[PDB]
Design a protein around this ligand. Structure first.
Ligand SMILES: *CC[C@H]1/C(=C/c2[nH]c(/C=C3N=C(/C=C4\NC(=O)C(CC)=C4C)C(C)=C\3CCC(=O)O)c(CCC(=O)O)c2C)NC(=O)[C@@H]1C
Ligand SMILES: *CC[C@H]1/C(=C/c2[nH]c(/C=C3N=C(/C=C4\NC(=O)C(CC)=C4C)C(C)=C\3CCC(=O)O)c(CCC(=O)O)c2C)NC(=O)[C@@H]1C
Ligand SMILES: C=CC1=C(C)[C@@H](Cc2[nH]c(/C=C3N=C(/C=C4\NC(=O)[C@H](C)[C@H]4CC)C(C)=C\3CCC(=O)O)c(CCC(=O)O)c2C)NC1=O
Ligand SMILES: C=CC1=C(C)[C@@H](Cc2[nH]c(/C=C3N=C(/C=C4\NC(=O)[C@H](C)[C@H]4CC)C(C)=C\3CCC(=O)O)c(CCC(=O)O)c2C)NC1=O
Ligand SMILES: C=CC1=C(C)[C@@H](Cc2[nH]c(/C=C3N=C(/C=C4\NC(=O)[C@H](C)[C@H]4CC)C(C)=C\3CCC(=O)O)c(CCC(=O)O)c2C)NC1=O
Ligand SMILES: C=CC1=C(C)[C@@H](Cc2[nH]c(/C=C3N=C(/C=C4\NC(=O)[C@H](C)[C@H]4CC)C(C)=C\3CCC(=O)O)c(CCC(=O)O)c2C)NC1=O
Ligand SMILES: C=CC1=C(C)[C@@H](Cc2[nH]c(/C=C3N=C(/C=C4\NC(=O)[C@H](C)[C@H]4CC)C(C)=C\3CCC(=O)O)c(CCC(=O)O)c2C)NC1=O
Ligand SMILES: C=CC1=C(C)[C@@H](Cc2[nH]c(/C=C3N=C(/C=C4\NC(=O)[C@H](C)[C@H]4CC)C(C)=C\3CCC(=O)O)c(CCC(=O)O)c2C)NC1=O
Ligand SMILES: C=CC1=C(C)[C@@H](Cc2[nH]c(/C=C3N=C(/C=C4\NC(=O)[C@H](C)[C@H]4CC)C(C)=C\3CCC(=O)O)c(CCC(=O)O)c2C)NC1=O
Ligand SMILES: C=CC1=C(C)[C@@H](Cc2[nH]c(/C=C3N=C(/C=C4\NC(=O)[C@H](C)[C@H]4CC)C(C)=C\3CCC(=O)O)c(CCC(=O)O)c2C)NC1=O
Ligand SMILES: C=CC1=C(C)[C@@H](Cc2[nH]c(/C=C3N=C(/C=C4\NC(=O)[C@H](C)[C@H]4CC)C(C)=C\3CCC(=O)O)c(CCC(=O)O)c2C)NC1=O
Ligand SMILES: C=CC1=C(C)[C@@H](Cc2[nH]c(/C=C3N=C(/C=C4\NC(=O)[C@H](C)[C@H]4CC)C(C)=C\3CCC(=O)O)c(CCC(=O)O)c2C)NC1=O
Ligand SMILES: C=CC1=C(C)[C@@H](Cc2[nH]c(/C=C3N=C(/C=C4\NC(=O)[C@H](C)[C@H]4CC)C(C)=C\3CCC(=O)O)c(CCC(=O)O)c2C)NC1=O
Ligand SMILES: C=CC1=C(C)[C@@H](Cc2[nH]c(/C=C3N=C(/C=C4\NC(=O)[C@H](C)[C@H]4CC)C(C)=C\3CCC(=O)O)c(CCC(=O)O)c2C)NC1=O
Lengths: 81, 164, 162, 177, 172, 173, 162, 177, 177
C-alpha cells in the first residue's frame, strides 16, 4: 500500500524538457508533464539507441574511382515481409 | 571554327552591324576563362605520349575480340593505326582547349566520322571506351586544377556524345 | 478524386468566395486525422503479401467450387489464381490510397466507377470479394483508432460491392 | 518566467509550454549562469536513457540477488518498473539542475518516497548505489570527460554543474536513506 | 484537382509501388506546418478586398493611360473588369496555398488566360504588375505575427511568393 | 435501372399548334445568342436568364454569378449551360431548394426550365426521384436533355413560358 | 445558413454517397474549434452595450457631419441615434451567431444578402459601419486563440461592406 | 525571347518606371549565383545523350504497345523520330535553364506542339512519361545524386535551380497535355 | 573521415556521414586492403534483404512450430519483429566486417541480447540456425559462388573476408548461446 503519498491520479508522472535549439532566431525550450513509459529490455538497449543499426551506402562504377563514395548512418529500421 | 569571337563576329556580320557591348563582353569572358582553359592544354601537351598509350590498351582490354583475325585489329599495323587515331583525337581536344570553342573537333574529327567508321567497319564504341577511360582517370586536385579539370572533361564528354 | 481539401476548395468556388474559416476547419480536421490514417496505411503496406495470400485462401476455402469449375472466370487453372491474387492486390492498394489521402476519392474513381458491368460481363461474382475483404478487415492486426480509421475504407468497399 | 514552468507541474495537465525571445532572455537573466546550465541539461537529456540502463546494469552486475528468483528485479515487469523509477529520478534531478533550486525535487518525488519503498519492500542500499552511479555519470558528462562520448561546447569551466548535481544527488541519496 | 498529398499518391501509383518509408515522414512534416499554413491563408483572406483596391490604386498611379479616355480600363464596366480579375487571381493563389501545390491554380485560372488577353486587346504586362503589386502586399501581410505565436513562417511565405510569380509569368 | 415511372399526359396550349403567323404582343422577346449580340445586349440576355429561373429578387448583388457571365461573354459556355450552371448555384439552393420538398421542387423548375405547367401530380411523383438518388445536378442534366427542351429552346435560347396568352383573348393565365 | 456540418452533409448528398470520414474529419475540426469560438461568443455577449455605445461614439467622432446634417438618413435628431445603435446591435448579433455556429452562414443569409440596395436606396454610407466594426475589432478585449477566432468574422463583414 | 533581365524590363516598361534599387536586388542575386547556374547547365549537357536514350527506352520498357506492330514507335523511322523528338525538348529546356526564363521554351518549341502531336496521332501519355523521366534525371544531375555517375563540384545545394528546371519540365508536360 | 564515422555510432543520431575523394583516400590509408574490403561490404548491402528473407524462410521450412499457433513467429506482430531483428544483426555484422574489428558488434547489439531473448521467451537455437544460414550466404556471396547471382570483380582471391565474417558470425552465435 502506497496511497498516502503517491495517489493513483498522479502515479508515475514526471516533467519532460525539450529543446528546439539550432543556433537560430526561432530557438525555443519547452517543459511538459507526462506519464512515463518503459519496458523490460532497456537494461542494455536504451530507448535513444534501441533498434538502431548502421547502414552503409556505396556509390561506385568500374573505373570511376574519382566518383566513388561511401556513407554511414543509423536510423530506425523495420523488416520487409 | 566555332569559338567565342567567331560567333559574335558572324552574328554582327549577318546583321550587318558594328560590334556593340554584347560582342565585347563575350571576349571579356574568354579573357576571364583563358587562365583556367590554357592550364589543361599545356599539360595535355606534356603528358600525351603516356595518356594515349595507356588509353589505347584500355580499348583492347574492354574488347579483346578486336585482335581476332578478320577484325579491325588483326595485325600490329592496324593496332598502330588505332593508337594513331586515338592520338589524333587527343590532339584535337588539346586544340579546342586552346581556341575556346569546339571548332577543331567538329571541323576535323566529328564531321564525317560516322561514314568512315561505318564503311571501314570500325567499331564506334571502341573509341568511346578509350575516351571514357581517360575521362574518369582525371582526379581533379592532382593532375590539373579544379577549374582546368572540368573544362578538360567537358570537351571529352562532348566528343563522347558526338560519337555516340 | 475527392479528399477533404478538394471539397473545401469546391464549396468556396461555387460562388467564387474566398476561403473562410468554414473551410479551414474542414482541412484542419483532415490534418488531425492524418497521423492516425498514415500509420494505418504504412502498416497495411507492410502486411501486403500475407493479407493477399490469406484473403485468396479464404475465398478458396469458403467457395471451393471456384477452383474446380471448368471455365475462364474461375481459378481452377493456374492463371486464374494469378488474376485472383491481382484483384485482391488492387483492392488493398485502393484501400491504402484512400487511407493516405483521407477520403474515398481514389477508389471512387479507380475502382467503383464501372464495377457493375465488369462483374456482369466477365461473369465474376461480387460475393467473392466480400469474403476477401472480410478476411482483411479482422486479420490486419491493427487495433484502436488506427484500425477504426482503416476499417471504414474497407467496409465502404463492402457496401458498394453489396 | 520560472513560475510558468512551475505552473505546468502545479496543473499536471500534460500540455506543453515553450519559452524563447524575451521570455527565454528573462529566464537566463533570472537563473544563475544560464548558457552553461543549458549545455548542462542538454548533456543530460541527450544521454538519459543510456544513463539509467548503465546504472541498473551496474547495480545488477554488482548484486545478482535481485535477478535471482525471490529478488526484487526478478520477473522482469518489476524490472521494467525499476527502470521507470530510475529514469523518473533522473528526470526530476535534471529539472532541479535546470531550475537551480531543489524544491520540486522535494515536493514531487522525494516527499514520502522512502516510506513507499519500505511498504513495497524495496531494498534501499541498491537504489543508493544506483543514484551514486547516476551521480558519477552526470559529473562525467558535465566535465566532458566521458571516455566514450563527445560533444563540442564553447570553451570554459563549469564548476557549478558538477557540484550542483552532486549536492542534488546527495539530497536524493540521503532522503531515500 | 490535386493537393500536395494526392501528388505523392499520383506518381506512386503511376510507378505502381507503395509509398516508401521516407515519404511518409515527408508528409508528416507537411502536416507539422499545418497550423502555420492556416494563419497565413487566413491573413490573406481577411483583408482580401484591401489588397486588391490598394494594388489597383497603385497600378493606376503609375499608368494613367489605363484610366485615360480611350484606355483599356477606362469605362466603369471595363474598370470593374480589372477588379474581378485581380480578385480571381488572388483567390486561386489562396486555393493553391492551402492545397500545397500549384496544380489547381494553372488549371482553372491560368489555363488560356494569355489567349484571352491577346484576344481582348488587354495588354499583357500590367496584369503582371498588378499581380506583383498584390504579391508584396500579401507576403508583407503574412509576416505580421500580431495575433499568432512567434516562429518561422518564411518557408511557407517563400511558397506563397512561389505561387504569385507563376501567376505573373503565365499572363505576359 | 429503375427507369422513369410512367405517368400520363394532359391537354395544354403548347401541346397544340398556334396558327399564328406574324404574332406581335404575346411573344416574349426570345433572347438568343445566335443573334450575335453586342456588349450590352448580352446584359439583356443575362438579365432575362436571371428573371427566368430566379425571380426578381434573386437578382440581388448577393445572388449574382459574376464569373458565369464572364464565361458567357467569351463564348466558353452556351445559354443552356449557363441556365443550369445557374440552377446549380447555391443561392438557388438555399433560397429555393431548402424551403420546399421535392414534389414542389419538381414543379418549381419544370415551369422555369421547360416553360410549361405540370401535366398532373403523377409527373411530379415520377420526377421527384432524380433529386434523391443522383441529386440536383443529376436532375437538371436529365431535364435539359429531353426532346421537350431541345426542340424549342435548343442550346442558345433563354427559356420562357410557352403559349401563355391566346391571341384574341386579353387575359390568359 | 452554412456551418461546417451542413457542407459535410451537402457534399455527401450530391452523389448521394454515405458519410465516410472524408466529412467526419471536417465536422471533427468544427468540434476542435468549437470551444475557442464559444467563449469568444460568450465574452462578446457579456460586452454588448459597452461595445455598441463605444462604436456609435466612434462613428460620431470620426464623421461629425452625421450629427449635424438635416436629413432622415442622419443621426442629427434623437431617433436617428436609435436607428444607428440598432444597426450596430444587429451587426454584433450576427457576429455572435457566426461565432456560435462556426461559419458565416447566419450573417450570409440575415445581413449581407441584399445589403447593397439597402445602403443605396435609403442613402446610408457603408463607410460608417466599417468604422463601427473597426472599433469593435481592437477594443473587444479578446486576445489569443479566441480573439483570432472572433476577429475573422468581424473583418469578414468589413470585407463584404468594402 | 526574354531573360532573367529582359523579363523585369518588360515588366517595368508597362509601368513606365525606371529599374530602381527595389527590384534590382533579384537581379544581383541572380548574378551572385550565376556560377552555380553554369555549373548546372554543364552537368546537364554533359550527359544529355544518355538522358534521351534512357528516357525513350524507359518510356518503352513500361509500355510495350508502342513497339508493337502499328504502334507509334514501331519502325526504325518512327523510333528515330522519337529519339530526336525528345532531344529537341531537352535542348530547349537547357536553353531556358541557361537564360533563366521559359520564354524561349514556350514559343520556339511549345507554340503549337499539341495540335502537331494530335495531327500525327502521337499518344500524349507516353510523351508525359518521357518528359517526367527526363525531369527525374535532370534533378538528379543538378543535385549530384545520380547513382551511376558522379560529377565533382564545390560545396552548396541547388534546390533553387532544381525546382526551376522542374517547373520548366512541367511546362512542357502541361503544354502537350 | 574515421572520426566522423565513429561520432555517428557514438551519438546514435541517425544523421548520415558523407566523404570526398581526399577523405576516402585517408580512410583507405587507415584500413587494410580497403579496395577489396569494399567489394565485400557492397556484396552484402546489395543482397541484404534477400539474405534475411531466405534465412527466415529456411528457418521456418525447417521448424514449422514457430508458425503454428503458440509459436513465436505466429501472429502479425511476431513475423515483422523477427525479420527486423535478423536484418539488424546483418547490418551490425556488415559494419564489423567494414571496420575490420568486432567492438561495436559487442557494444551495440551483442551486449545483453541473450538475456533479452530469455526475458521475451525467444527460442535461441532457431536464431542460431538463422545466423548460420546468414553465414553461409555471406561466404557464398564473398567467394562469388552464388549459384543464382553474379557480380563482376577485379580478379583475385579474398579468403580473409570469408574467414573474417565467419569469425564474426560465430561470435554472434556464441554470444546468443
Ligand atoms: C479472388 C479471385 C477470383 C477470380 C478472379 C478473376 N478475375 C478475373 C478477371 C478480371 N477481374 C477484373 C477486375 C478488376 N480489374 C481491375 O483492374 C480492377 C481495379 C481497377 C478490378 C476490380 C477485370 C477487369 C478482369 C478481366 C481482365 C483481367 O484482369 O484478366 C479472372 C479471369 C476471367 C476471364 O479471363 O474471363 C479471374 C479468374 N475469379 C475466381 O474464381 C476467384 C474467386
Ligand atoms: C451608425 C448609425 C448610422 C445611421 C443609421 C441609420 N440607419 C437607418 C435605417 C436603416 N438601416 C437599415 C439597416 C439594417 N436593418 C437591418 O435589419 C439589418 C440587419 C439585418 C441592417 C444592416 C434599414 C433596413 C433601415 C431602414 C429602416 C430602419 O431600420 O429604420 C436610419 C434611418 C434612415 C431613414 O429613416 O430613412 C439611420 C439614421 N445613420 C447615421 O447617420 C449613423 C452614422
Ligand atoms: C585528323 C583527323 C583524323 C582522325 C580522327 C583519325 C580517324 C581515322 N582512323 C582511320 C583508320 C583506322 N583507324 C583504326 C582504329 C581502330 N580500329 C580499331 O579496332 C579500334 C576501333 C581503333 C583503334 C583503337 C584502324 C585499324 C584503321 C585502319 C583501317 C584499315 O584500313 O584497316 C582513318 C582512315 C585513314 C587511315 O588509314 O589512317 C581515319 C580518317 N585519322 C585522322 O586523320
Ligand atoms: C593530363 C592529365 C593527366 C592525368 C589525369 C594523369 C593520368 C595518368 N595517371 C597516371 C598514373 C597515376 N595517376 C594517378 C592519379 C589518380 N589515380 C587515382 O586513383 C585517382 C583517381 C587519381 C588522382 C589521385 C595515380 C595514383 C597513379 C599511379 C598509380 C596508378 O596508375 O593508378 C599516368 C601514368 C604516368 C603518370 O604517372 O603520369 C597517367 C598518364 N596524367 C596526366 O598527365
Ligand atoms: C559489472 C557491471 C558493470 C556495468 C554495467 C558498468 C556500469 C558502470 N558504468 C560506470 C561509469 C559510466 N557510465 C557512463 C554512461 C555512459 N557512457 C557513455 O558514453 C554512454 C553515453 C552512457 C551509457 C553507456 C559514463 C559516462 C561513465 C563514466 C565514465 C566511465 O567510467 O566510463 C560505472 C562507475 C560509476 C562509479 O561508481 O563511479 C559503473 C559501475 N560497469 C560495471 O562494472
Ligand atoms: C514521482 C515520483 C515517483 C517514483 C520514483 C515512483 C516510485 C514508485 N515505485 C513503485 C514501484 C516499484 N519500484 C520498483 C523499483 C525498484 N526496486 C528495486 O529493487 C530497485 C532498487 C528499484 C529499481 C531500480 C519496483 C521493482 C516496483 C514494483 C514493486 C511491486 O512489484 O510491487 C511505486 C508503487 C506503484 C507501482 O507499483 O508502480 C511507486 C510510487 N513512482 C512515482 O510516482
Ligand atoms: C537553448 C539552447 C542553448 C544551449 C545549449 C546553450 C548553447 C550555448 N552555449 C554558449 C556558451 C558557453 N557554454 C559553456 C558551457 C560549457 N562549456 C564547456 O566547455 C563545458 C563542457 C560546459 C560547462 C557546463 C561555456 C563555458 C560558454 C561560454 C561562456 C558562456 O557564454 O557561458 C552560447 C553562447 C556562445 C555560443 O554561441 O557558443 C550558446 C548559444 N545556449 C542556449 O541558448
Ligand atoms: C482554423 C485555423 C487555424 C490556424 C490559423 C492555426 C492557428 C494556430 N497556430 C498555432 C501555432 C503556430 N502558428 C504559427 C504561425 C505563425 N507565426 C508567425 O510568427 C507567423 C506570422 C505565422 C506564420 C503564418 C507558428 C510559428 C506556430 C507555432 C508556435 C510555437 O512554436 O509555439 C496554434 C497552436 C496549436 C498548435 O500547436 O497547432 C494554433 C491553434 N491552427 C488552426 O486550427
Ligand atoms: C521546335 C520543336 C520541334 C519538336 C518538338 C519536334 C516536333 C515534331 N515531332 C514530329 C514527329 C514525331 N515525333 C514522334 C515522337 C514520339 N512519338 C511517340 O510515340 C513518343 C511519345 C515520342 C518519342 C519519344 C514520332 C513517332 C513522330 C512521327 C514519325 C513518323 O510518323 O514518321 C513532327 C512532324 C515531322 C515529322 O514527323 O517528320 C514534329 C514537328 N519538331 C520540332 O521542330
Ligand atoms: C523498363 C525499363 C527501364 C529503364 C530503361 C530504366 C530507365 C529509368 N531511369 C531512371 C532514372 C535515371 N536515369 C538516369 C540516366 C543516366 N544515368 C547516368 O548517369 C547516365 C549518364 C544516364 C544514362 C544511363 C539518371 C541520372 C536517373 C536518376 C536516378 C539514377 O541515377 O538512376 C528512371 C526513374 C525515373 C523516375 O524515377 O521518374 C527510369 C524508369 N528504368 C527502367 O525501369
Ligand atoms: C564557363 C564555365 C563555367 C563553369 C562550368 C562553372 C564552373 C564553376 N562552378 C563554380 C562554383 C559553384 N558551383 C556550385 C554548384 C554546385 N555545387 C554542388 O555541389 C552542386 C552539385 C551544384 C549545385 C548546387 C556551387 C555551390 C559553387 C560555389 C558557390 C559559388 O561559387 O557561387 C565556380 C566558382 C568557384 C570556383 O572557381 O570553383 C565556377 C568557376 N562556372 C563557370 O563560369
Ligand atoms: C525449406 C526451406 C528452405 C529455404 C527457404 C531455402 C533457404 C536456404 N538458402 C540457402 C542457401 C543460400 N541462400 C542464398 C541467398 C540468396 N540467393 C540469391 O542469389 C539471392 C540473392 C539470395 C536471396 C534468395 C545464397 C547465396 C545461398 C548459398 C547458395 C545456395 O545454396 O543457393 C540454405 C543453405 C544454407 C546452409 O545451411 O548452408 C538454406 C537452408 N532452403 C531451404 O531448404
Ligand atoms: C541493437 C540491436 C537490437 C536487436 C537485435 C533487437 C533485439 C530485440 N528483439 C525484440 C523483440 C522480438 N524479437 C523477436 C525475434 C525473434 N523471435 C524468434 O522466434 C526468432 C528466433 C527471432 C526472429 C528471427 C520477436 C518475435 C520479438 C517480439 C516478441 C514479443 O512479441 O514480445 C526486443 C524487445 C523489444 C520489442 O519487442 O521490439 C529487442 C530488444 N532490438 C535491438 O535494439
Ligand atoms: C567505394 C567503392 C569501391 C569498391 C567497391 C571497390 C571497387 C574496386 N575494387 C578494386 C580491386 C579489387 N577488388 C578485389 C576484390 C575481389 N575480387 C574478387 O574477385 C573477389 C570476389 C573480391 C574479394 C572480396 C580484388 C582482388 C582487386 C584487385 C586487387 C586490389 O586492388 O585489391 C579496385 C581497384 C582496381 C579497379 O578499379 O578494379 C576498385 C576501385 N573500391 C572502391 O573504392
Amino acid at each position: 500500500l502506497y496511497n498516502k503519498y503517491f495517489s493513483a491520479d498522479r502515479l508515475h508522472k514526471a516533467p519532460e524538457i525539450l529543446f528546439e535549439y539550432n543556433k537560430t532566431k526561432y530557438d525555443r525550450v519547452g517543459v511538459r508533464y507526462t506519464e512515463v513509459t518503459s519496458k523490460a529490455s532497456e537494461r542494455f538497449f536504451p530507448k535513444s539507441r534501441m533498434n538502431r543499426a548502421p547502414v552503409i551506402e556505396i556509390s561506385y562504377r568500374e573505373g570511376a574511382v574519382s566518383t566513388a563514395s561511401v556513407s554511414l548512418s543509423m536510423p530506425e529500421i523495420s523488416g520487409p515481409p | 571554327m566555332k569559338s567565342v569571337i567567331t560567333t559574335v563576329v558572324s552574328a554582327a556580320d549577318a546583321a550587318g552591324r558594328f560590334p556593340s557591348n554584347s560582342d565585347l563582353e563575350s571576349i571579356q569572358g574568354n579573357i576571364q576563362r583563358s587562365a583556367a582553359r590554357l592550364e589543361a592544354a599545356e599539360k595535355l601537351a606534356g603528358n600525351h605520349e603516356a595518356v594515349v598509350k595507356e588509353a589505347g590498351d584500355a580499348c583492347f582490354a574492354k574488347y579483346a575480340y578486336l585482335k581476332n583475325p578478320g577484325e579491325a585489329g588483326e595485325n600490329q599495323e592496324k593496332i598502330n593505326k588505332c593508337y594513331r587515331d586515338v592520338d589524333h583525337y587527343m590532339r584535337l581536344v588539346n586544340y579546342c582547349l586552346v581556341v575556346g570553342g569546339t571548332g577543331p573537333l567538329d571541323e576535323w574529327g566529328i564531321a564525317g566520322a560516322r561514314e568512315v567508321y561505318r564503311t571501314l567497319n570500325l567499331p564506334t564504341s571502341a573509341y568511346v571506351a578509350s575516351i571514357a577511360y581517360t575521362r574518369d582517370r582525371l582526379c581533379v586536385p592532382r593532375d590539373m586544377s579544379a577549374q582546368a579539370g572540368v573544362e578538360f572533361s567537358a570537351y571529352l564528354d562532348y566528343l563522347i556524345n558526338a560519337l555516340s | 478524386m475527392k479528399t477533404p481539401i478538394t471539397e473545401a476548395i469546391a464549396t468556396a468556388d461555387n460562388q467564387g468566395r474566398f476561403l473562410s474559416n468554414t473551410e479551414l476547419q474542414a482541412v484542419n480536421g483532415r490534418y488531425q486525422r492524418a497521423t492516425a490514417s498514415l500509420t494505418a496505411a504504412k502498416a497495411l503496406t507492410g502486411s501486403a503479401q500475407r493479407l493477399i495470400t490469406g484473403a485468396a485462401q479464404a475465398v478458396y476455402n469458403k467457395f471451393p467450387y471456384t477452383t474446380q469449375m471448368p471455365g475462364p472466370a474461375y481459378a481452377s487453372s493456374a492463371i486464374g489464381k494469378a488474376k485472383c491474387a491481382r484483384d485482391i492486390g488492387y483492392y488493398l492498394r485502393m484501400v491504402t490510397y484512400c487511407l493516405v489521402v483521407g477520403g474515398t476519392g481514389p477508389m471512387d474513381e479507380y475502382l467503383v466507377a464501372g464495377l457493375e458491368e465488369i462483374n456482369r460481363s466477365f461473369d465474376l461474382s461480387p460475393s467473392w470479394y466480400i469474403e476477401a475483404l472480410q478476411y482483411i478487415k479482422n486479420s490486419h492486426g491493427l487495433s484502436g483508432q488506427v484500425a477504426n480509421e482503416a476499417n471504414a475504407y474497407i467496409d465502404y468497399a463492402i457496401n458498394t460491392l453489396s | 518566467m520560472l513560475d510558468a514552468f512551475s505552473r505546468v507541474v502545479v496543473n499536471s495537465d500534460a500540455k506543453a509550454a515553450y519559452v524563447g525571445g524575451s521570455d527565454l532572455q528573462a529566464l537566463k537573466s533570472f537563473i544563475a549562469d544560464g548558457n552553461k546550465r543549458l549545455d548542462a541539461v542538454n548533456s543530460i537529456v541527450s544521454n538519459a536513457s543510456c544513463m539509467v540502463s548503465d546504472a541498473v546494469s551496474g547495480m545488477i552486475c554488482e548484486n545478482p540477488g535481485l535477478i535471482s528468483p525471490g529478488g526484487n528485479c526478478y520477473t522482469n515487469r518489476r524490472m521494467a518498473a525499476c527502470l521507470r523509477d530510475g529514469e523518473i529520478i533522473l528526470r526530476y534531478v535534471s529539472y532541479a539542475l535546470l531550475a537551480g533550486d531543489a524544491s520540486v525535487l522535494e515536493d514531487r518525488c522525494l516527499n514520502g518516497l522512502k516510506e513507499t519503498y519500505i511498504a513495497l519492500g524495496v531494498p534501499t542500499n541498491s537504489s543508493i548505489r544506483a543514484v551514486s552511479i547516476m551521480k558519477a555519470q552526470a559529473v562525467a558528462f558535465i566535465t566532458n570527460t566521458a571516455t566514450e562520448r563527445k560533444m563540442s561546447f564553447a570553451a570554459g569551466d563549469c564548476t557549478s554543474l558538477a557540484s550542483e548535481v552532486a549536492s542534488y544527488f546527495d539530497r536524493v541519496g540521503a532522503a531515500i536513506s | 484537382m490535386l493537393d500536395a498529398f494526392a501528388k505523392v499518391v499520383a506518381q506512386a501509383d503511376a510507378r505502381g509501388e507503395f509509398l516508401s518509408n521516407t515519404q511518409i515522414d515527408a508528409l508528416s512534416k507537411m502536416v507539422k506546418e499545418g497550423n502555420q499554413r492556416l494563419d497565413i491563408v487566413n491573413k490573406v483572406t481577411s483583408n482580401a478586398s484591401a489588397i486588391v483596391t490598394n494594388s489597383a490604386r497603385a497600378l493606376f498611379a503609375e499608368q494613367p493611360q489605363l484610366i485615360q479616355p480611350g484606355g483599356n480600363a477606362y469605362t466603369s464596366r471595363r474598370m470593374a473588369a480589372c477588379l474581378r480579375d485581380m480578385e480571381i487571381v488572388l483567390r486561386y493563389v489562396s486555393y493553391a496555398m492551402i492545397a500545397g501545390d500549384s496544380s489547381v491554380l494553372d488549371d482553372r485560372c491560368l489555363n488560356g488566360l494569355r489567349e484571352t488577353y491577346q484576344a481582348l486587346g488587354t495588354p499583357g504586362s500590367s496584369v503582371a504588375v498588378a499581380i506583383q503589386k498584390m504579391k508584396d502586399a500579401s507576403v508583407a501581410l503574412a509576416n505580421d505575427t500580431t495575433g499568432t505565436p512567434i516562429g518561422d513562417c518564411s518557408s511557407l511565405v517563400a511558397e506563397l511568393a512561389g505561387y504569385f510569380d507563376r501567376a505573373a509569368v503565365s499572363v505576359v | 435501372s429503375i427507369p422513369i415511372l410512367k405517368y400520363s399526359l394532359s391537354t395544354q396550349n403548347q401541346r397544340v399548334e398556334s396558327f399564328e403567323v406574324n404574332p406581335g404582343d404575346e411573344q416574349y422577346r426570345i433572347y438568343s445568342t445566335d443573334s450575335l449580340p453586342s456588349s450590352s445586349e448580352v446584359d439583356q440576355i443575362i438579365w432575362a436568364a436571371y428573371r427566368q429561373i430566379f425571380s426578381e429578387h434573386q437578382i440581388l448583388k448577393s445572388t449574382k454569378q459574376p464569373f458565369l457571365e464572364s464565361q458567357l461573354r467569351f463564348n466558353q459556355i452556351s445559354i443552356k449551360d449557363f441556365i443550369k450552371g445557374l440552377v446549380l448555384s447555391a443561392p438557388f439552393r438555399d433560397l429555393n431548394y431548402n424551403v420546399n420538398n421535392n414534389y414542389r421542387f419538381v414543379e418549381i423548375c419544370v415551369q422555369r426550365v421547360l416553360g410549361r405547367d405540370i401535366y398532373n401530380e403523377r409527373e411530379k411523383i415520377a420526377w421527384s426521384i432524380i433529386i434523391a438518388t443522383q441529386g440536383l445536378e443529376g436532375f437538371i442534366d436529365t431535364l435539359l436533355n429531353t426532346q421537350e427542351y431541345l426542340s424549342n429552346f435548343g442550346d442558345s435560347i433563354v427559356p420562357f413560358q410557352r403559349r401563355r396568352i391566346i391571341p384574341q383573348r386579353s387575359k390568359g393565365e
